[PDB]
Nucleic acid binder design. Structure first.
Ligand SMILES: [Mg+2]
Ligand SMILES: [Mg+2]
Ligand SMILES: [Mg+2]
Ligand SMILES: [Mg+2]
Ligand SMILES: [Mg+2]
Ligand SMILES: [Mg+2]
Ligand SMILES: [Mg+2]
Ligand SMILES: [Mg+2]
Ligand SMILES: [Mg+2]
Lengths: 194, 94, 130, 94, 117
RNA sequence: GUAGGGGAGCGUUCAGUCCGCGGAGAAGCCAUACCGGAAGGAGUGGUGGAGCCGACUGAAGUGCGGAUGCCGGCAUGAGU
RNA sequence: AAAGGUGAAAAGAACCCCGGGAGGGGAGUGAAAGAGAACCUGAAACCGUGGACUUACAAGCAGUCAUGGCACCUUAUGCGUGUUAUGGCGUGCCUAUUGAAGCAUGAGCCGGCGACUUAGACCUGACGUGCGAGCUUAAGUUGAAAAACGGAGGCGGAGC
């Protein structure tokens, strides 16, 4: 039930998720997402096998005050680790219903406050990066917020490059994380929208 | 906001650490610590000594299509040879 | 006062009557015996005793006593006729090793070690008690 | 004092276990047992005929005392903190 | 990722150690022996904490019948005659009444006498 | 109250957010009579000289007195 | 096998003093030498120096409680802190056990390392979430600051 910033109207479509903004599902979603991103890289020599050591030692019974088999065991120094990390995945598929329920619930979570849909990007005028600051100031972005821009038109994205103000998300490749992370979501391009 | 984002409220508990616990020394005192041999089944206890043969086959099996299902609801769309897949018999194979 | 590094740079940290023998190869436990008689009496006596004390540790203990008197008399502008050991004491040492006995838990057993342990230091002040 | 006053101890700030009614100097009174005051001595039940008065000074929490317990060879160590509450009452009365 | 034990053990240990003060020799200095001293120390702490009350009981009594006897009665006899009079629920710490204030304790004695014969 | 089962939590590394702090000085180390029901946590003071708390969430090589345990260091036997 | 660190910068210590030396004390450079080449921090065991209170008729798991002396007042003049004299009480820890102060195992002391884990379209249960008589995808394809697609198949749905 929402306005467009330039040109047309619409966005009175899109029934938002019920109840409005359930944060549990949100948490589930993002957690899944970071978990998807998580890259297992494990530098561990677990086994007494991994590290380099010859394996027969010295006398068993009869040396006294001793008791050992080998130098590669985890009770030794320099040896293997008992239960260290190995190269795993931890990537799964969260059920798709929730995969699409989430981002909707995010956009919904942007209805307690500011969000925006745009058309007519010609106010950018190539890139120049300056006219993006302008466009923002005229469209109400102090740049004291954090902003995510979702649009096509490479000319239009590439106007925005900076840490302070904004971040860019092409071709409606949107992330529940990315939009929930930033303060303002500029939904911009009305393609995936409406 | 991710930082104001809450938990599941009771999805998971924390795991189980047997390190510490001030007087945990785990499992069973003798006998059945350390082994990977536990193994609940096996021919030893009262499975063999039990007297059957018969023989295995399991031939043709059919989709069970409830009458109650067919009647009552829908249209009587005259099910026949194709539409039926959308009617939830879904098998193939049989 | 001001703050930390202010104090640090307005003040250079003197050490009146102080000198130290580092690393004299000898065992400090021994050297304490020599030192203990010196401590507390007038640096003259100290020089005498030390001349006449039969321990070999007496030797570098005398060598140091003078340097600390010598520091007192020159750097601190003190009075050698008010001079006495305010303090002396011995400890430490990076106890020596060549680690030539590579030890396979056997056949040489345990021997040697040669403590570097000396670190003899003495500190001189003026009596002025009278 | 088992709980609640007695005898004669006069013009003195002291402590008891918690006073029920809180206040800044909300008056609390006590019936007696003996009296060392008045430069005389006469026993009990003649002190039930007398009434001492006292004002409530502050409501306190005493000094923290740790509670440790241990049993040999069974494991079993127990650590718990304890602070027992009080009321400082000032005593001047008949 | 690993978590080295760093500064965790050391802290705990330092705390235990600090609990040990006028402890003789090894106890006050090296950890293990300190800690395990502190186990038996617990035992004596809590138990003597329940105890000192038995102790002070003993002391006070030991004074009370002392004074009683100075007057010609005893603890048995004194509390017998005192409590025989519904007069005195007096009881607690009364020892210092015998110790500090003699005339009073004398009156309590004579009271205990009138409550006998 | 022992094996055993159930409940609440403390502390440590990493990660994402949040809030911030630091050469008028970070963490770390040192002492300390305060706070908390415990794991523990602050206040200030001394060291240090380049970095780091707090909050929420997530992941662990995550908590030692023992194993004639491992590497190291330093004692006792002794000025024998 | 172990083995890393001055400082921003060599400005890495001319000169002077004690000493054959090693070593240190000044001067000087430097923000700092509370960085000096046995050069970041610098714990603990362990050895000393000085001080406070103490100890030479007392049978001691070293503590614990109670009181007195003495000394100290930065969370700190109080329910204090340190030390002590006397009284009462008081059979290390762990393990293994019918039973441990045990004249039964273990261990010199302090660091630091050191033990219930990971995996699979597995099996079963508890809690939580999404759809709900339906519920889901796998390989793979495509975008990849980002994820969608992919119904092969699997599980309910009928039993004997
Ligand atoms: Mg066992
Ligand atoms: Mg000889
Ligand atoms: Mg001998
Ligand atoms: Mg001999
Ligand atoms: Mg005080
Ligand atoms: Mg144990
Ligand atoms: Mg048993
Ligand atoms: Mg034994
Ligand atoms: Mg024995």
């Amino acid at each position: 039930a929402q306005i467009n910033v330039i040109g047309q109207n619409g966005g009175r479509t899109i029934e938002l998720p019920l109840p409005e903004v359930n944060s549990g599902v949100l948490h589930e979603v993002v957690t899944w997402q970071l978990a998807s991103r998580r890259r297992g890289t494990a530098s561990t020599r677990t086994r007494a096998q991994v590290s380099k050591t010859g394996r027969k030692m010295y006398g068993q019974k009869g040396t006294g005050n001793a008791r050992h088999g080998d130098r590669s065991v985890p009770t030794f120094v320099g040896g293997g680790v008992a239960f260290g990390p190995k190269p795993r995945s931890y990537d799964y598929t969260l059920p798709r219903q929730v995969r699409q329920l989430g981002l909707a619930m995010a956009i919904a979570s942007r209805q307690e406050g500011g969000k925006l849909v745009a058309v007519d990007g010609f106010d950018i005028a190539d890139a120049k990066t300056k006219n993006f600051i302008s466009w923002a100031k005229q469209n109400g972005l102090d740049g004291t917020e954090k902003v995510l821009l979702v649009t096509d038109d490479e000319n239009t994205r590439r106007a925005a490059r900076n840490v302070s103000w904004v971040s860019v998300l092409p071709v409606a490749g949107v992330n529940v994380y990315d939009i929930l992370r930033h303060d303002r979501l500029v939904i911009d391009a009305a393609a995936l929208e409406i | 906001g991710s930082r104001k984002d809450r938990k599941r409220v009771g999805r998971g508990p924390g795991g189980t650490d047997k390190t510490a616990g001030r007087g945990h020394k785990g499992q069973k005192s003798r006998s059945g610590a350390g082994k990977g041999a536990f193994f609940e089944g096996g021919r030893s206890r009262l499975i063999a000594r039990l007297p059957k043969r018969g023989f295995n086959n399991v031939g043709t099996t059919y989709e069970v299509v409830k009458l109650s299902q067919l009647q009552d609801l829908e249209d009587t769309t005259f099910d026949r040879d194709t539409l039926e897949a959308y009617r939830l018999v879904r098998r193939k194979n049989r | 006062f001001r703050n930390k590094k202010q104090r640090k740079q307005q003040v250079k940290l003197r050490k009146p009557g102080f000198a130290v023998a580092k690393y004299v190869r000898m065992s400090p436990r021994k050297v304490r015996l020599v030192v203990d008689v010196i401590r507390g009496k007038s640096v003259q006596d100290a020089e005498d005793l030390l001349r006449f004390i039969p321990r070999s540790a007496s030797e570098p203990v005398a060598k140091v006593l003078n340097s600390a008197k010598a520091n007192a008399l020159h750097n601190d502008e003190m009075l050698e006729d008010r001079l006495f050991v305010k303090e002396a004491y011995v400890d430490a040492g990076p106890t020596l090793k060549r680690l030539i006995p590579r030890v396979p838990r056997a056949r040489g057993s345990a021997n040697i070690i040669k403590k570097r342990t000396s670190h003899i230091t003495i500190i001189v002040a003026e009596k002025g008690n009278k | 004092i088992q709980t609640g006053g007695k005898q004669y101890r006069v013009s003195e700030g002291d402590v008891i276990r918690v006073e029920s009614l809180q206040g800044e100097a909300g008056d609390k009174v006590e019936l007696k047992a003996l009296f060392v005051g008045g430069e005389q001595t006469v026993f009990g039940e003649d002190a039930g005929k007398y009434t001492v008065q006292a004002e409530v000074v502050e409501h306190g929490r005493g000094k923290k005392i740790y509670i440790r317990k241990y049993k040999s060879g069974v494991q079993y160590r127990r650590r718990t903190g304890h602070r027992q509450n009080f009321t400082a009452i000032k005593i001047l009365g008949i | 990722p690993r978590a080295k034990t760093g500064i965790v053990r050391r802290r705990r240990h330092k705390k235990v150690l600090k609990r040990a003060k006028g402890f003789w020799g090894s106890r006050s200095k090296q950890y293990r022996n300190a800690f395990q001293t502190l186990l038996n120390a617990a035992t004596y702490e809590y138990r003597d904490r329940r105890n000192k009350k038995r102790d002070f009981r003993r002391l006070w009594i030991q004074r009370i019948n002392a004074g009683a006897r100075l007057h010609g009665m005893n603890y048995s006899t004194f509390i017998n005659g005192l409590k025989r009079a519904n007069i005195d629920l007096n009881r607690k710490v009364l020892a210092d009444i015998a110790a500090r204030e003699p005339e009073a304790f004398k009156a309590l004695v004579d009271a205990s006498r009138n409550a006998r014969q």
